[PDB]
Write a protein that binds this ligand. Sequence first.
Ligand SMILES: CC(C)[C@H](Nc1ncnc2[nH]ccc12)c1ccc2c(c1)S(=O)(=O)CCO2
Length: 168
Amino acid sequence: VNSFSGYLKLTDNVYIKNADIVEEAKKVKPTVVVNAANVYLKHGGGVAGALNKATNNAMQVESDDYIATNGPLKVGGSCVLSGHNLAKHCLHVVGPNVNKGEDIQLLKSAYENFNQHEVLLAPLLSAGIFGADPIHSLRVCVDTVRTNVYLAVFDKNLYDKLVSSFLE
Ligand SMILES: CC(C)[C@H](Nc1ncnc2[nH]ccc12)c1ccc2c(c1)S(=O)(=O)CCO2
């Protein structure tokens, strides 16, 4: 149903809110929720862990079956699988992990995947333990994505910094 509410409008197609992406998925019932995935779709911690646990592990079981037959994704790539109880579809997107020496330039390719969907609920790619500068990730999102993206950022201090920095 895509019933998003409480978002700050950054541009004509990018919105942001201080919220857990899992609680937003349950309230909004989006067509697409983006996962902050890794290439073997191992959803143990962070955003992926929170989404998988909200599916009661159904996301991990389906992801393991996909990897068995198809192998790992590439950094900057994506894969549409079921959204289970959270969304119609889950778009698993692999942003670069700069804390593990991956190339930050591939962050643009990661966001380009969003342009295949009219509207998406998404986390801020390559932030948290993946190490990218969160202000840089938001700029790559705004400059790359054309479709309507609702960013859920589950940390008040980071949210307040991103908004303040964007409004400079
Ligand atoms: C920057 C934080 C606040 C953000 N966490 C979140 N953002 C939105 N809903 C959330 N629910 C639970 C955590 C969570 C974030 C965004 C991207 C990201 C990771 C974390 S990660 O470290 O798990 C792996 C790389 O990708």
